[PDB]
Amino acid sequence: VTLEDALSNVDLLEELPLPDQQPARYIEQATVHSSMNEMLEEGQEYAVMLYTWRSCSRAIPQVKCNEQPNRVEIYEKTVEVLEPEVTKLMNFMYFQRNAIERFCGEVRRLCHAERRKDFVSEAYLITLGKFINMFAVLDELKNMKCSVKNDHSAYKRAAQFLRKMADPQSIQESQNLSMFLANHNKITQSLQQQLEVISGYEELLADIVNLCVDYYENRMYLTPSEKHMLLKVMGFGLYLMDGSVSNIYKLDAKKRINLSKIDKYFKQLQVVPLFGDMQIELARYIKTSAHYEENKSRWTCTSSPQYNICEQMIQIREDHMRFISELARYSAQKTDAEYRKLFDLALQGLQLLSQWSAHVMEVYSWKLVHPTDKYSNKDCPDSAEEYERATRYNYTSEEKFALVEVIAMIKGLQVLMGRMESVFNHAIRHTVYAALQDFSQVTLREPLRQAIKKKKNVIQSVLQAIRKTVCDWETGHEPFNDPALRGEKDPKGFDIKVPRRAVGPSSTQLYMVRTMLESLIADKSKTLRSSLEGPTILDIEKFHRESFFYTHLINFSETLQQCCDLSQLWFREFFLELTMGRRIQFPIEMSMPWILTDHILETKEASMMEYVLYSLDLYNDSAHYALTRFNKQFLYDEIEAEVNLCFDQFVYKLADQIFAYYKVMAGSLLLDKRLRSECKNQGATIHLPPSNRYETLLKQRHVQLLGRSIDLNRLITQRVSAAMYKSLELAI
Amino acid sequence: MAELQMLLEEEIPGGRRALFDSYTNLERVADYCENNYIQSADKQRALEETKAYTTQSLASVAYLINTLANNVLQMLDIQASQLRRMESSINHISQTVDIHKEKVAR
Amino acid sequence: ELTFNAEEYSDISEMRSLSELLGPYGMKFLSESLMWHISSQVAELKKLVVENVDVLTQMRTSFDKPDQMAALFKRLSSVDSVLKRMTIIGVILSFRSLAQEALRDVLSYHIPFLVSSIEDFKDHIPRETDMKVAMNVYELSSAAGLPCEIDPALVVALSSISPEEEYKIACLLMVFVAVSLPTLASNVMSQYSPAIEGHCNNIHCLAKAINQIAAALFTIHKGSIEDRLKEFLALASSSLLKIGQETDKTTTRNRESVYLLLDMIVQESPFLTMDLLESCFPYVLLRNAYHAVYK
């Protein structure tokens, strides 16, 4: 009935033995930002809907003649089965038209002559970049998907035969959707055409690209998704710039944008995962530029090495050890130093996990985009599908081992970080609150005093708004004896007690404070920066650059899970569409986790034996991704069907090799040593059996797969018992 | 051995029934607190009322989970001990059997 | 090259033949002699333990403050002699274990009825009973070569300074051994060899040495083995993890190989579980070390 009693109950519950575990005007800006976010949530939904579309016309009983007894009978079934599927296409067309119109309207609004040299927040520019990336990915999904057109036009033949489209508006909308689907690169073309009509949009694209380049250069990102989004936005913006009116090459000579940095970034990193199993080639946006023909010499990224993951394992391993060692030592109230240490440790761990995930995704995408051939790889047969050469024969044993090791390290670090969820959350939130309060209550005092003293009302208003939005007065009100408010210098003084509690600021408050604070430092803004001294602006930039990751760290669990996403290693919709009905679904030997596990088992590598289980939860990750993001039942059904046989094969092979190794070791133990020495001297040495670490797998009783707990030990015991009985019978 | 059946068919089902009753009552209480906050003249009263309700429910859930968990642990301990006891009697039986076989051979 | 091959005298077949020739009396005599040697080694170790009592006493209370432990470790004298003696004790204990398992295998088919009766009696003996009858039961079981948790011969040897003072020395011995573990990382001979499943300087027997010595000492002094072994594990984990941050190749030549000592200790120790190791030492480091020592 009281808070103290409830806390006590929780402690009591935790105290149980659990052995055998393992073996202003900113309001308008906020509203527009919210609207953009809402639009984005819908665009992502439409993109995921498009990605997971399968040809629905294949199952139709195609009619060869025009006088079939049931020709009229199947059209109603086709109509009633494809009506909702065409409703989705109509909704997608309406949504994309509305999104294009809204983006053009916002661009026009922010491109006005008087509004050109005003102040605009960086978040809005990032949102516009997200919008252009969404448009690009939607156009790519529309282009790649060749089954949507067939399904829609089959429904068209089904509806027109029944004469159910007699309504003129129905005919008009059907024609509009048909022509929308027929055209190639329709979304990009329409947006581009609507862009030239506006004058000066190149400047908005330019400052967006500059912001993205600055963010990428300073590593102003946490999750690999943002790292790839920055490059995708840069490329798409560069593509949009080149046209009839605006030329990047002439713009570059004006130093408005930097092309060398983008070229180097593309050269270092060439491919990123656009969506699902599809990857985007960054240099394509440049090679397809309007004026690329006469300026190809300017770009080295387009012309053509460093994706080999086997040569980067030393740094990965060393980093992993150093971090694990640092974290192990942090397994009643503490000082701010400990909380800051925990905060920085959590940030470093998240950054390292993101770096590893980015490396893995980049190498996977590069391998996908660069399939091998029998000329290069001798093992590859003459006949093979695109996915075969792309994945199965495109990896070496060392490369597979490196990938498995990286994945296992990522998952181990993830679980270790999750074990310390509460401590990390408390430390991060306490540090954030202390920093925010100390800043807003001490650092802004001197600047405020200066502003009041020199009658700077513009600065005074925003400073007071900042100090009123977040500051929490322990006394319940702003102090009245503060000399800064009166403008006269403080004595000698005036100690103020800042309270301390563990809570992060609300998203709205943090965004509002950041937007106000980085408005004072704005060069473009009569510049407000010109009305402030040096030390105050330096401290303001330091605080602004430090507070970037507050939102990400507050949602520590979501950020941690996002930085370790590996669900994109199983989906094969793109390659399935590239088959056009020949392959309904790829066999077992094409899913990367299965190839890794089978290679590890067959090669019988002692070092990699302990990673076989770590290389098996990719199925769980993919199932979670499908059930939470894609929300498609058939994907989960196929994953479960594949796992049902993958686990059986793995168990059988593991038991067989374990029994063989144990029998060989037993036989070698009893062999006479003098005979072995004599044979070695004579030149007939009997090779000893290499050691192995099967005991770790033998002591495993918690193998988790799709919510199922499997007792591997029981199956291994049954298999070894059968083998022993067979051996005894054979001996008899 | 009697306490095994007691703890099996009188404690665990009681905890289950209690936990399902808790889920239904908790949904009802969230709806009730939301309603009280907007059809009450004194918002602070509903807030305190809401705070009290949230504090309570947590304690009840924790207590039920603790009791249930304790019961499960005790049941497992009882079962393991009985299994161990059975293993001793079975070993004695096997010793008697092979002794009889050796006697027959002699 | 020596004049004899140890593999032609310590093999299972050779050990089985030696046990058959000797019998329980001969095996008991050999075990008694080995326990005499181990008792001499422990008596020599106690001198080094007592001569550094002051630093060790402060070390136990400062495990959470590395700043003072770094300076304290520099004042310790003869940090390698203790490791060498513990390695010798571990080698002797491993030889005893080989002899005992050979004897158990030999007797398993010669007198099956008596062996089965002894196994049944020992297995179902309540541990709550006082050590007075448990020692006799363990002695009877070990006479046939059974794997008793507590070695009665070792207890008798080590039983043969006030009572409170002898307990403090025993407690400080574990702390002294724990802090000296990282010193092995700088030894070039501490390289783990997969073909041997152990280190080249026999430092892998340190686990058995520590476990047996702690058990005997803390059952002689009516101490708590579990608690004392848990203290040893915490101190050893902290010392090893501090090494992980360091980058000097010379001092960390075989750090990964040394990291496996905790895993071996937990595996072969009947009083420690993997849960305790995980709470103070992540298993990912051990997995990475196992990967590295194989290539």
Added chain:
Amino acid sequence: NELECVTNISLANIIRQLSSLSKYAEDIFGELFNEAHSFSFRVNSLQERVDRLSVSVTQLDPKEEELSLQDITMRKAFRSSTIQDQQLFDRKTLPIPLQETYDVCEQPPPLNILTPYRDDGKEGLKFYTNPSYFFDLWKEKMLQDTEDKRKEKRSVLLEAIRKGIQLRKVEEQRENDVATILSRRIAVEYS
């Protein structure tokens, strides 16, 4: 106050999360109770069996023992159970929470209503997604590989023992199990 309205909404959401936690505990506890109750049934049954066996064994008589040399192999031989678990990822094994998480997800299109109008009679939905495709293609490939692999490789007790060997010879040994298929391939790679 808008802030006061927010806190009330947060408290309601917290109560909902408490209910979700209640269901995350209840399902686990129910599953544990079910499995432990089955274990208790097994233990009680084997306890009855053990006491019956003990009361039977405490009556044996060495003089009663009679050995028949002729019946030594005429006797059926005893074999221990050799049951092996398989198909561990079937629908029946799906936990309830995953059941709610899945049944709420989008269902596949009703392509199964077109089967009557198909000349071959093949299931319409199988043209959309075929979970059994993995199994059938893998089995076909394994059989084809095995078929290629074989080509690539290429007194009265006296009466009793005679009868035993005759029975063993005549009574020799007599599929959609992956283990059987693999055992066939490796045995074929051998002769």
